[PDB]
Amino acid sequence: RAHRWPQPLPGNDRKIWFGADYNPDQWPEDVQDEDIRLMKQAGVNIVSLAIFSWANIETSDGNFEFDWLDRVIDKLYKAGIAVDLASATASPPMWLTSAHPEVLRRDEQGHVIWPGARQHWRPTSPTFRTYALRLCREMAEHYKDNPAIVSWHVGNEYGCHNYFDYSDDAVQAFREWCRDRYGTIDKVNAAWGTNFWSQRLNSFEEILPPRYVGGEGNFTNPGRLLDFKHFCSDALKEFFCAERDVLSEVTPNIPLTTNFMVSASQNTLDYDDWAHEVDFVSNDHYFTPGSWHIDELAYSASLVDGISRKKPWFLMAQSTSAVNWREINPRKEPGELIRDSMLHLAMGADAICYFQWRQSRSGAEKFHSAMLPLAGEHSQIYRDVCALGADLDTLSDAGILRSKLSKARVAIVQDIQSEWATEHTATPTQHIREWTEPLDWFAAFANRGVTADVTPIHAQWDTYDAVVIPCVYLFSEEMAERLRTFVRNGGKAFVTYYSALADEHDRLHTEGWPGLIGDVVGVRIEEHCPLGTLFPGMLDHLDVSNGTVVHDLADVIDAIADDTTVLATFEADPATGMDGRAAITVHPYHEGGVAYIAGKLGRDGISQSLPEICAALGFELDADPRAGDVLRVVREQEDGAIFEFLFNRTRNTVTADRPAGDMLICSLATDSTDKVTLEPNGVLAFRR
């Protein structure tokens, strides 16, 4: 599927896009001149329109009014502001759900999901599909021929709320998905191990989705659950593809996207898979408060880039300050608004947008920050948004557009499907999920001055000097071979606990762990040692001999190969059986290359262990112990021009080596002759 990036309005140059969700249909019409006036002053040059506007467009069944939308598009176009137009199909009107309550999502207990919030429709309902596909057709027909429209924003965050449906529509389509993937019922029975607890299937007609099995102390089929999660993603991908085929047929030159929600902990949609279906990848991401703020945002933006295969990507939403949807919504500290935007940009984005333009006075999102606060033009956030628009204009003129996130020395593998598998309630421990571990390695390498590339499992991590395999619970035979081949030919691999436990069907590998690849890794494990404080006197941590500490889970390593070296061992009470067992090992395999980390060390423990592990593998690290003070993010043009961003990672002002080049952008920082200065949350960009 070819990359096609939204293009300028007629007579404008190519620029970093900079905008917001705009919702003028929630204000009186006469607010729009001020909006536009402030958007111009802020250097805003695109808005996303009509995302949730279904009910103000098809105002009653069969009745489509476009006037208010055409008027504001006109006003925006005359001002030089492009329009990312939504399909308007995110959330249906009251008249549609009143009249057809059968579009309503059902939860795992059979609860109806009422109107009164959003995205409360069943992804596989035919009635709902027909309405959507009609609105799509009407929107497209009305706006082909309209030159303000530069891209389609199809739907909105599919499966954010409606990922899991259990309606009879879902019952039916999950069967058909099973028939299509498995052909014959006996193939389904093998994939799921239905000979456990009299679950054996006679026919496809017998397959149900994992509805309520009584809650706690009751365990649903794990392979079925995996496939169900797969199916839920596919069902909405299918729905999205249909909406987009309809818009594209009528407006073939108009590039189409939908907004992803890629973040460290996202555990529903398989975005890498959806990525084959969009003309350019776009993402919505909101900061994690506290210490994780910087590293988890960088990690995420890197993964977007990975999912993107290094094509430029579109930041469709983030917050200027507080969000509204956590138990506690911290505000952003000074400089974090410009800094976070620059982090997404540094990680390859060529568009930077917010939810949303103007703060609502009312509705569930009234407390969600915006580009123009209820406090108005004379506010810190608006001033900062203006400074940010100028910075992006400056970076547009410096020629940053279309440069790629340069290729890191290390790839960190991310794998939603391994994440699904690790969510079963009957694993060795609920305290391990796949998603935390790749983030831990990303931060630890950053701590040692290394910017890793986060890559989905199907991307080309096997072309990097090095790869991290973190809790990659699912290993197929083709994955085994890819990994084997990689290390054979000179690859360095860091491989952790919880990797290669099962095949792609969640069928646990036999004869010892890691499954399939024990030859490459040169380690053998018969069982896990989970850790915690569930009951008094439980073994709750395991010290490691280099001064670190494992929590949640260690591997019990039974034996290692003759040419495996032990870098570190566990230190425990002798009654545990863990004392003196191998905790960190290194093992050659032809021209590589394999380190094994036999429990959860956390960002800090990985970081402590990195020098020793890398030395033994041949992977070179900056000797500077200031290495972790700053995150260094580099985009490259094919023509040779290099853009390097620096971010302070820490809670004090730091000083660092000035890179070569022209200083382009600076927030809470200072350029000098030898040394660059960065305040907390400061950032610099250089071209060289």
Chain positions 573 to 632 lying near a copy of itself, rule: CB under 8 A, are 573-577
Closer residue to a copy of itself in complex, CB, 302/319: 319
Of positions 368, 448, 524, 581, contacts ligand GLA by CB under 6 A: 368
41 interface partner picked from a copy of itself, ligand GLA, none, CB below 5 to 8 A per type: none
**Residue 365 engages a copy of itself in binding (rule: CB under 8 A):** yes
284 interface partner picked from ligand GLA, a copy of itself, none, CB below 5 to 8 A per type: ligand GLA
CB of 364 to ligand GLA, least distance (A): 9
319-348: which residues touch a copy of itself (CB under 8 A)? Answer: 321-322, 324-331, 333-334
Closer residue to a copy of itself in complex, CB, 58/391: 58
Token duo for residue 650: 């820490």
Instruction: Write the DSSP assignment of 548-610 as a string of letters.
Output: -EEEEEEEEEEEE-TTPEEEEEEE--GGGS-TT-EEEEEEEETTEEEEEE-EE-HHHHHHHHH
Where does this chain touch a copy of itself (CB under 8 A) — which range of 145-153, 390-398, 448-456, 674-682? 674-682
130-189: which residues touch a copy of itself (CB under 8 A)? Answer: 160-161
**Residue 527 engages a copy of itself in binding (rule: CB under 8 A):** yes
Spatial distance between the Cα atoms of 429 and 620, rounded to a whole number of angstroms: 35
**Residue 284 engages ligand GLA in binding (rule: CB under 6 A):** yes
Instruction: Write the DSSP assignment of 394-409 as a string of letters.
Output: HHHHTT-TTPEEPPPS
**Residue 362 engages a copy of itself in binding (rule: CB under 8 A):** yes
Q: How many residues bind ligand GLA (CB under 6 A)?
A: 11
CB of 483 to a copy of itself, least distance (A): 21
**Residue 323 engages ligand GLA in binding (rule: CB under 6 A):** yes
Spatial distance between the Cα atoms of 452 and 413, rounded to a whole number of angstroms: 10
Where does this chain touch a copy of itself (CB under 8 A) — which range of 69-77, 108-116, 481-489, 491-499? 108-116
Spatial distance between the Cα atoms of 577 and 623, rounded to a whole number of angstroms: 37
Nearest to 572 by CA among 581, 564, 563: 581
Closer residue to a copy of itself in complex, CB, 112/242: 112
157 interface partner picked from ligand GLA, a copy of itself, none, CB below 5 to 8 A per type: ligand GLA
**Residue 253 engages a copy of itself in binding (rule: CB under 8 A):** no
Is the preceding omega at residue 593 within 30 degrees of 0, hence cis? Answer: yes
Closer residue to ligand GLA in complex, CB, 157/272: 157
Closer residue to ligand GLA in complex, CB, 118/632: 118
Give the three-class secondary structure for 414: strand
Of positions 435, 513, 589, 645, contacts a copy of itself by CB under 8 A: 513
449 interface partner picked from ligand GLA, a copy of itself, none, CB below 5 to 8 A per type: none
Spatial distance between the Cα atoms of 133 and 128, rounded to a whole number of angstroms: 9
Spatial distance between the Cα atoms of 33 and 23, rounded to a whole number of angstroms: 14
**Residue 535 engages a copy of itself in binding (rule: CB under 8 A):** yes
What is the b/e burial string over 548-576, where b = at least 16 CB atoms within 10 angstroms of the residue's CB? Answer: bbbbbbbbbbeebbeebeebbbbbbeeee
**Residue 267 engages a copy of itself in binding (rule: CB under 8 A):** no
Spatial distance between the Cα atoms of 609 and 602, rounded to a whole number of angstroms: 11
Of positions 41, 172, 184, 291, contacts a copy of itself by CB under 8 A: 291
Closer residue to a copy of itself in complex, CB, 44/322: 322
**Residue 485 engages a copy of itself in binding (rule: CB under 8 A):** no
Between CA 452 and CA 295, with CA 416 as vertex, the angle to 5 degrees is 35
Closer residue to ligand GLA in complex, CB, 162/259: 259
Of positions 35, 58, 84, 157, contacts ligand GLA by CB under 6 A: 157
Spatial distance between the Cα atoms of 599 and 578, rounded to a whole number of angstroms: 12
Token duo for residue 428: 């060795």
With 0-12 / 13-18 / 19 or more C-beta atoms within 10 angstroms meaning exposed / middle / buried, residue 437 is buried
CB of 161 to ligand GLA, least distance (A): 10
Spatial distance between the Cα atoms of 679 and 670, rounded to a whole number of angstroms: 9
Alpha carbon dihedral 545, 548, 550, 555, in 10-degree steps, equals -40
Q: How many residues bind a copy of itself (CB under 8 A)?
A: 136
CB of 126 to ligand GLA, least distance (A): 26
Nearest to 109 by CA among 210, 231, 223: 210
**Residue 344 engages ligand GLA in binding (rule: CB under 6 A):** no
